């Protein structure tokens, strides 16, 4: 086509989606990770994760307001990945890298799994 | 913080939100523009437009499944702007620029209004 493109548009959209999440506006699901609860938008979770994409395209699970993750999932690892979904920024540290990588593998977030693998390989 | 950032994340999220829109997945509103209907995600509309942000933060309108726009709004101008919201690409042409600018002013999409003003000024 002959379209013009606004370079900062995608980043501005994601910034506003994170502002809606912070104010709990139009969040339509609670993700339960052991004792911890995380409110989010189903569409953003699907757009970032192969696991959530599979869950919310399922004809019965698409209507659930609560999703319980596997008990082996670490709430801090999930929190870090949820923040990444809404910001593009990943808080990867020596103390959390193993939990973040395991959570990203479970959530099917291949770019996160890739950077975790590279950061671990460098420390070996 | 000491975060790492994935450059293509925001663009990848927006691409997936557009794929969900194209397959009519988890769309929660229909925007009526005279005889034409457009399905969308309330969160994306709010993230792109000052008008939709005001509408869906309203305690009564947040729950409506149908929103009717002002009869002066051109359906093609709306379609072009809805496509821009989901892609960052604006199909701006001599034949549609006046309708696109008027629709962007109504929707409160200041970056679109700005480029329309500059493109019109250049043709004068």
């Amino acid at each position: 086509d002959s379209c013009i493109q606004f370079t900062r548009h995608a980043s501005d959209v994601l910034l506003n989606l994170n502002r809606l999440r912070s104010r709990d506006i139009l969040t339509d699901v609670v993700i339960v990770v052991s004792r911890e609860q995380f409110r989010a938008h189903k569409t953003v979770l699907m757009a970032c994760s192969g696991l959530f994409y599979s869950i919310f395209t399922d004809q019965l699970k698409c209507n659930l307001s609560v999703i319980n993750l596997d008990p082996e999932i670490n709430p801090e690892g999930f929190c870090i990945l949820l923040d990444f979904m809404y910001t593009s920024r990943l808080n990867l540290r020596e103390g959390n890298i193993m939990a973040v990588m395991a959570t990203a593998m479970y959530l099917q977030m291949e770019h996160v799994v890739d950077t975790c693998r590279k950061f671990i390989k460098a420390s070996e | 913080d000491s975060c790492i950032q994935f450059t293509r994340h925001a663009s990848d999220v927006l691409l997936n939100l557009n794929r969900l829109r194209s397959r009519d997945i988890l769309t929660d509103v229909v925007i009526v523009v005279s005889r034409e209907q457009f399905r969308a995600h309330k969160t994306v509309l709010m993230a792109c437009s000052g008008l939709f942000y005001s509408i869906f933060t309203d305690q009564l309108k947040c729950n409506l499944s149908v929103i009717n726009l002002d009869p002066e709004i051109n359906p093609e101008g709306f379609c072009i702007l809805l496509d821009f919201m989901y892609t960052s690409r604006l199909n701006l042409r001599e034949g549609n620029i006046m309708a696109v600018m008027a629709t962007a002013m109504y929707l409160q999409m200041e970056h679109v209004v700005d480029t329309c003003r500059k493109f019109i000024k250049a043709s004068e």
Binding site: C3, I4, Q5, F6, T7 | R89, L90, H111, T115
Partner: peptide, 4 residues
């Protein structure tokens, strides 16, 4: 704005 750019030419993509």
């Amino acid at each position: 704005w750019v030419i993509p």
